[PDB]
Amino acid sequence: ALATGNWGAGVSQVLNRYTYSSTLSHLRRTNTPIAK
Amino acid sequence: YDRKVPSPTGEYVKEPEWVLETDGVNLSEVMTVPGIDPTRIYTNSFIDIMEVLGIEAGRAALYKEVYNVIASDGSYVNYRHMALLVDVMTTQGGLTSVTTVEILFEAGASAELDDCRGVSENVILGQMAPIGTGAFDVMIDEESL
Amino acid sequence: EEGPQVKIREASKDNVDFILSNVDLAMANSLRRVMIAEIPTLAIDSVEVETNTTVLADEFIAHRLGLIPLQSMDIEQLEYSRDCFCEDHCDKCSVVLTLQAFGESESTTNVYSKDLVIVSNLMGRNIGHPIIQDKEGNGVLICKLRKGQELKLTCVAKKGIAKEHAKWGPAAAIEFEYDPWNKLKHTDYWYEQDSAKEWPQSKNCEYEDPPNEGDPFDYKAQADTFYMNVESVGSIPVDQVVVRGIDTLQKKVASILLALTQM
Amino acid sequence: DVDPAKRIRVSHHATTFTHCEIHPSMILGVAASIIPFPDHNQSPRNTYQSAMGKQAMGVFLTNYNVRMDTMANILYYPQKPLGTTRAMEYLKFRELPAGQNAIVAIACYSGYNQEDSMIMNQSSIDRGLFRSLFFRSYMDQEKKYG
Amino acid sequence: SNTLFDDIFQVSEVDPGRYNKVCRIEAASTTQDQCKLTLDINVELFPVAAQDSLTVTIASSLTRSWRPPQAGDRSLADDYDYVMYGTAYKFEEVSKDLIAVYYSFGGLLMRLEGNYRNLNNLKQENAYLLIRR
Amino acid sequence: MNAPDRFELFLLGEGESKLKIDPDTKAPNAVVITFEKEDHTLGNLIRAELLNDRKVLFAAYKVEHPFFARFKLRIQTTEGYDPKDALKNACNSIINKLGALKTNFETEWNLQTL
Amino acid sequence: MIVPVRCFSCGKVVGDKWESYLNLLQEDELDEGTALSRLGLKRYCCRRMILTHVDLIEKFLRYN
Amino acid sequence: KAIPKDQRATTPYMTKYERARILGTRALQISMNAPVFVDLEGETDPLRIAMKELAEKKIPLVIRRYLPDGSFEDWSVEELIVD
Amino acid sequence: DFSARTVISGDPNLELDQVGVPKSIAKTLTYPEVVTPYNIDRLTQLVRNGPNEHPGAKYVIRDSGDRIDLRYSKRAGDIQLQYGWKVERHIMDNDPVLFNRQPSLHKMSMMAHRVKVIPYSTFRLNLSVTSPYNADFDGDEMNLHVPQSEETRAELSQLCAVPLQIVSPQSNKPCMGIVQDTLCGIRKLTLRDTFIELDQVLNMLYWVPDWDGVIPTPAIIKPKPLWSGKQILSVAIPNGIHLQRFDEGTTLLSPKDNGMLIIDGQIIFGVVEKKTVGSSNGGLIHVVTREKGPQVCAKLFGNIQKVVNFWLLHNGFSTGIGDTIADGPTMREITETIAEAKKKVLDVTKEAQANLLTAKHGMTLRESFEDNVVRFLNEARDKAGRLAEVNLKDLNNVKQMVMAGSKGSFINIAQMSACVGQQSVEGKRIAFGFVDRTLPHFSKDDYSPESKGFVENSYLRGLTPQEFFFHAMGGREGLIDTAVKTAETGYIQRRLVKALEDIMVHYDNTTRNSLGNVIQFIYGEDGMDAAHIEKQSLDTIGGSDAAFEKRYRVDLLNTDHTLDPSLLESGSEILGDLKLQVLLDEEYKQLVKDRKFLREVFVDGEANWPLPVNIRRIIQNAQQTFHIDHTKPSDLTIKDIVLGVKDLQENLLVLRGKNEIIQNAQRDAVTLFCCLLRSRLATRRVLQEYRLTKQAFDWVLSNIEAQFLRSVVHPGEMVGVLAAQSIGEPATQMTLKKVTSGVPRLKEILNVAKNMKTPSLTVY
Amino acid sequence: TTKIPQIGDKFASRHGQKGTIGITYRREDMPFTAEGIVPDLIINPHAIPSRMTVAHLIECLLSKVAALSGNEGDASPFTDITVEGISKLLREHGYQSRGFEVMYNGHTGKKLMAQIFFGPTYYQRLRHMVDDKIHARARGPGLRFGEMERDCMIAHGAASFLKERLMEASDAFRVHICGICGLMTVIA
Ligand SMILES: Nc1nc2c(ncn2[C@H]2O[C@H](COP(=O)(O)OP(=O)(O)OP(=O)(O)O)[C@@H](O)[C@H]2O)c(=O)[nH]1
Ligand SMILES: [Mn+2]
Ligand SMILES: [Mn+2]
Ligand SMILES: [Zn+2]
Ligand SMILES: [Zn+2]
Predict the structure, then answer these.
(1) In the beta sheet, which residues pair with residue B139?
(2) Which residues carry this modification: N-acetylserine (chain E)?
(3) Is any atom of ligand 1 closer than 6 Å to the C-beta of D140?
């Protein structure tokens, strides 16, 4: 499931490493699947 | 509202008028209310306009709904393009919305005659489409010196 | 000696501030442009890397090498490599320099441009030598090693013009101003409440008479006097940025006469 | 007697506070904490920066020379920004920066910088401005289930 | 080859409005109750003040290139301070039973009200304009 | 890549000349000369001198695109005065006044300490 | 990664000034701007060069 | 089903589309070494030739215009007005 | 297949109709060219250079269908071409190719360009083609397609070429104009006070490529030869171009330097800005296109750009933080302006709080409250913004951009310098998403400005944290709204195109579908092409009855109301003539009916409507071309005018059928143009206002006729697709009252939905 | 590989507006300040007033001071830093205080009529550049022509182009056809 995102899916993704703060940002992201 | 109207000496003037505006629509009945001008009643529901006043008056409402949309954003599109649309929407007499093997079987059984004027049909046949530069034939002028 | 007049006000091994006086703007700006762009100079322009266990990459290093300024007083007496009849390079078109470094110490070993060894025959033309201007005579820091790390290279220097790449430029900044008061109305000053309160006075104004409020604008005046200041990086002494500057123009123009003649 | 150039703040008409913020700039996340003066920008723009920053080149870790990843971009000469935010200290943006302080003019000068385009100094590029390393790694496996 | 109107004017008014190098004189004729000048002038090359006074001549020479001074180092069909060269675009405002002729000097504008020279002022361009102080 | 070598800014291709001189059809005693591997340095300078010459009716230069080092100078002159002569006369001034200046300078520079 | 050799904009050598700048802060206790002006980096282009360098090689050298 | 030369009711002006298709059919043939009818007062470029041809009214071709119902009119290049 | 794609950049040194194609792309794409005696030497040279030197060639094919590969082929340096082989050559300068920015929502997103081979790696374009393509130079790419045969090359140059798309059917005006720098600067260049000296002048002159070699004569000779900015631009505007325009109190002495007047291709008065050189109904690019043709119009964009961007490169223009700071005194006024709106709000508050406010009619109390507080707060923003605008000087570079038309507007001044204003989410003030409050830093039941989203600060001053968060609420709603618009618009655009795609104009002038059904009996009700139509005023319609009868009535039996004999050579001799007066009565009766007809068509009185053939500009030309003295009676006769204008009507032909039915259609098609015509060429106007001669008048007519005939739409045009793309393309720039509006409405229309969101009856 | 910046590469400040480099100019040809400072980058004024990116402009002012003075400039949100205060400090250091300077045209040396807002600002090089993005597929042995492109070509009326482009090279086979029963039943 860690290798896939298979769960709910996009749940696990490869860590960005373009720049130091894009990494910190990726570790701090959130997602909402599917009224405002 | 201000209404431009000719004055007694002939030039256009403003003359205000009260107007009512409603939520909801009942055109066939409100038309009939004493005291209104039934010749100038309107609605943004062009369907009802077609149901009570007929296809042509629907066509003209529909144009005026489409024009409003375009102008409310502030742009301007020549008359004829929205005229074309609206004609296409009203030429069968009502308001019609504009929005494989299986199908050839149906063609068979119905005896569908394909006019061959479209670009895809012409592609499949290796031809130009009778549009634009293909809407005439060019031939060798044996009649010349 | 009639003509364009000179007037040094300061000079130093490194800068020369002056005033050109009795010339057109065009010639003055042109000599500015030449000093920036077209005086020949010597610079590492090929680098062969035998070893680099350094924490930098090679082209990173190479690039830095092409930027170390290298003595260039005798550079008329080096031919352009493309003009020389050798196969590739030689002593008429090239200095060759070497660099070896090894991090022998525990603590971190720096590599500087004094560690550059010339390995080719100079014919006693003063060229090639890393220029060194710091108190400690290290010149430029090229790299840094850790105990165990190695770097060995050769470089070839070659004569070149900053048009081609800026590493070959002798000049650094070139101050250039005229008409400090604004009398010529060549510029129109932006301001909120008052143009004079709000813009600072140039140092060059002392040198030149303020205008007087009556004085109806002078339509006939031209830009005849220029406050310059040329700054050298050191591969060529200064006075020589100017004179070879003036000299480079004068040769450009002559190649034009020479080529009318050949029509 | 307030500073005409300060912004207007609408005072404490409050005697009942139970708490106080530590600092208002802490409503931002990582990306928007690298924008200088976000409070002087139209709000969608701070949104588009927060995306673009993620595409800038810098030094993503100090160990890059030792890793082997599909792709990497390291700028030759990272500089720390002359204009920083107090949030940066924690994001280490001064230590692993992703930019350079470029001398910028805002001007029409020849027409080659119209419609969100720019003129850059070739001499300055010659001397290293915005140069960067790119690395690609390719992999391959061997035999398998034959 | 000629000249074609020539007179002396009193300056009512000098408006710079919005510009710095250019202003609009409102001038009168000392002489005719009828003839006026509304006219745009480069005030930096040729300043001008309230009530100053002005010897104004339209003329029509001394369409081929333009060649610098030289011809001008004797040849001046000018003894004046201030010479412009424009184009009449006229509207013959033929108003009351007085004329108005219009003229544009690469967009510094003139207007003459008056009457006596209706058989005088070119239908047409080739028109210079000349001022001494 | 697609980047033309930098040497191309100062150094003539195979078959290119320093000058090409062409007669101008628009007006008389007019020429257009195209200078290769040159730019404003020279072009603004020659040009500005051609205008200190009173037998010079017209002069002007332009670099038509910044990607190529080439300029085009248009000289018109009085009847009997060849334009190519006006350009020797003008290149000759230049070289003279600079002459002058490298001397006034070489001088001011020994009168000097530090 | 290292001090760049020149100011990107004006060409002035600046890569011979890093050890000194850092000596002028830690050894003789000047503020960063007085220090830069002492090494003669007086246009804001060169000052930006030293003032905003980050010596990342000092980190790279800790690896074996 | 053909419409006699008199009685023709469509425009006597050439249309952009006919023009384009003419010039281009004729440059195709000029491009394959077909004989030209006009004086090449220098031109080497087949479209350009074709246009000089059209201008000298030396393109011997006929435009067959079909009307929606199947019938058609024949207009010669010579005769079509070119504006 | 035969196409390339890269990044685009602008180039001020390319012509409108060029595209720069990098050399490496030009070495990869090819055109098959047949060997003939006209090209066998150039083809030979190109073969010899081969695949990797541009101008070269990649294959040779012989008689056989054999394909010779130049890169491998041991005989690649020894090919003796035969007549009739083919060579596939790299593309080269001046080959037509088609260029396209996606999404291609209207046909001017795919135009044919002339190649220009260039070094580095981007496709490069003229600035002024950017706006059709909806492209700019921050990463955009575009695609280039190379046609493969002679016929295909001719189609693309004789119908898709850029210069043929200047004036588009979509809105019967140009789709390309001068923009950005060249527009900031052409106004600067054209101010009163801009003069240039001789050195600069001659270099600007040489910069126009087909300057005849004449140095114009300078506007100042006297202390100094100084030419104006106007005159120098004028060297790019060609001869025989006339254009006039009056703005809010422009006169023929434009005190302000307003308006515009240009005569024989020289600017007389007015500053050149977006209304003259922009993409505007009736400006210069529309005029030149029609008076001189597409090629010359397309050079004019490059000549204006060359001249003006030269000038601007040496004049300079910039903007900076200072251009957003307004005066101490202005700030105090702005802050009081704002203080007063908050006090308005506080009373309307106290008022609703004591129950003394009334709603009016179906509108709740709280909705009335809100409506009022928002009007106060907007009206504050606006006044505060007007304040700042006023206070900024003409040298304020923000203001200079705004005045030129090249970028920015009032709201931007305002929000930058005075106050950003009320934020909103779904048409309302920021709502109470915690309980009874918008954020925990406020106490409950707070309806004040601060509390619900008024941002009092400008951007210069900066936002507080609360305002910052509400402005981001707002913002966010635009970013979402924007993606939904983009998606909604794109689907609409594809469905209208699919519905109309087959409709075509036929050689009977009817518009029909692929079945042959009739959609329209003549396209557009008038048989015209919308590119050849311009807004003109129909004069008969407006005005008082007295004024209409001074202008048009000629009574030859009355000494007050005849034609003065200074109008006309016959004038003495027609006084009291009875049979002329019969004609003239007939012309007046027709003007009278015209006015009544048109007042029934246009109930409103709107006089300005798009028609083909810009008569006023034909008259103004005739007046320039025949050097016409306003001081000499004309030698026109009554009958020449009157019967000349009647005859002309018979030749303005759109339908040509011999029967009655087709005749009626023809006469109905051309009615409105014929009213415009009789109003413009009526006797008293022709003599008294225009003063035409016979010769001029005869030329006016024959031209109206040629121009009319050339406006007729061409059979074969695919007006369907056109209609669809003209309606959908501008439905995509709806990136943006209490009736359902804009795109969702427009969905509701095309869907024919039974259940509309806001149905409404308007009852008079 | 090392990537040296080129025409086509993208760059951005931190205020939400990018550009690609449209050309490079060597320093001689750049405009310059009386101190001979020259810009590393030149951005167009038209990219400013509608985007209302005031922080770009204030970062550049504050950045100029910081360089001149050797302090880090405090650009955090919600402080008391002001343009006025910034502009004072930059005056104390001898420049005009809104960050304008006189500059001079490189080609000529002459002064520019207008002055120029000039200062350092932090710019980022973005990934994804003219060499990754250019391709060019014309065969030997986006980037398409879809439904919308076709529709544009129909609007222009370009039928021959539409047939050439959408053909097969799948060869034109020939066939006889009865004129009564249109079928390919004919024995030839
Ligand atoms: N005419 C005009 N266009 C503007 C103005 N201000 C901003 N733009 C834009 O801001 C929006 C988004 O910003 P950008 O990323 O720069 O636009 P873009 O270049 O098309 O974005 P990309 O799709 O990545 O190419 C676009 O819709 C542009 O219209 C203005 O004042 N005038
Ligand atoms: Mn953009
Ligand atoms: Mn874009
Ligand atoms: Zn050698
Ligand atoms: Zn520097």
Answers:
(1) H62
(2) 1
(3) no
Assess whether C144 and C45 both reside in one domain.
yes
* Ligand 1 contact, I408 CB (< 6 A): yes
Q: Are residues C161 and C232 in the same domain?
A: no
Range of the domain at F101: 1-114
- The neighbours of chain J, by the rule of 3 or more Cβ pairs under 8 Å, are B, C, D, F, G, H, I
Interchain contact I336–H (C-beta under 8 A): no
Minimal CA–CA distance to F78: which of F58, F60, F52? Answer: F58
Q: Is the CB of D115 under 6 A from ligand 1?
A: no
Write the burial class of residue E55 (CB in 10 Å: 0-12 exposed, 13-18 middle, 19+ buried). middle
| Counted domains in chain F | 1
Indicate the SS3 state at residue I288: helix
How many domains is chain G partitioned into structurally?
1
**Is D69 marked as binding a ligand?**
no
Whole-angstrom Cα distance, residue I167 to residue F42? 43
**Same structural domain, C238 and C207:** yes
> What separation in angstroms does the CA of C240 have from each of B34, C15, I431, J130?
103, 11, 73, 42
With both helix axes pointing from N to C terminus, report the angle between C239-261 and F40-50 in degrees, rounded to the nearest 10.
70
Which superfamily does CATH assign the domain made up of J5-141 to?
Answer: DNA-directed RNA polymerase, subunit 2, domain 6 (2.40.270.10)
How many distinct structural domains can be found in chain C? 2
- Domain membership of residue E109 as a residue range: 1-133
Judged by phi (left if over 0) then psi (alpha if -120 to 50, else beta), residue E80 lies in beta
The shortest C-alpha distance from G42 to chain D (Å) reads 15
Claim to verify: residue C150 and residue C60 sit in the same structural domain: yes
Neighbours of chain D (3+ CB pairs under 8 A): A, C, G, I, J
Residues of the domain holding G20: 1-64
Q: Which of E20, E38, E86 sits opposite I219 (nearest CB)?
A: E86
Q: At what angle do helices F40-50 and C25-37 cross, to 10 degrees?
A: 160
Say if ligand 1 is within 6 A of residue J51 CB.
yes
Report whether E109 contacts E117 (CB < 8 A): no
Smallest CA–CA separation between B85 and chain H, in Å?
Answer: 21
Residue with CA closest to ligand 1 atom 21? I138
Rounded CA separation I222/C170 (Å): 48
CA of J37 to the centre of ligand 5 (A): 7
Domain holding G30: CATH number? 1.10.10.60
Number of domains into which chain E is organized: 1
Give the position, in ligand 1's atom list, of the atom nearest the Cα of I409: 31
Residue for token digits 């980050």?
Answer: G54
| Domain coverage including residue C203 | 1-40+167-263
- Rounded to a whole number of angstroms, the distance from the CA of E66 to the nearest CA of chain F is 8
Residues 6+ apart with CB under 8 A from B71: none
Tell whether J31 is within 8 A of chain C (Cβ): no
I141 in ligand 1 pocket by Cβ < 6 Å? no
Cis peptide before I103 (omega within 30 of 0): yes
Listed in sequence order, the DSSP H helices in A1-36 are 20-26
Helices (H) and strands (E) in chain B, counts: 6, 5
Task: Say yes or no: F48 contacts chain I, CB-CB below 8 A.
Answer: yes
Residue nearest to atom 15 of ligand 1 (CA): J17
State the DSSP code for I493: H
B contact residues 113-132, partner H, Cβ 8 Å cutoff? 130, 132
d(Cα G57, Cα G61) in Å, to the nearest integer?
6
Q: Does J182 touch chain I (CB under 8 A)?
A: no
Q: Is D116 in the active site?
A: yes
CB atoms under 10 Å from CB of C77, counted, come to: 12
Domains of chain H: 1-83 (3.90.940.10)
CATH code, domain with E77 = 2.40.50.140
C73 and C48 in a common domain: yes
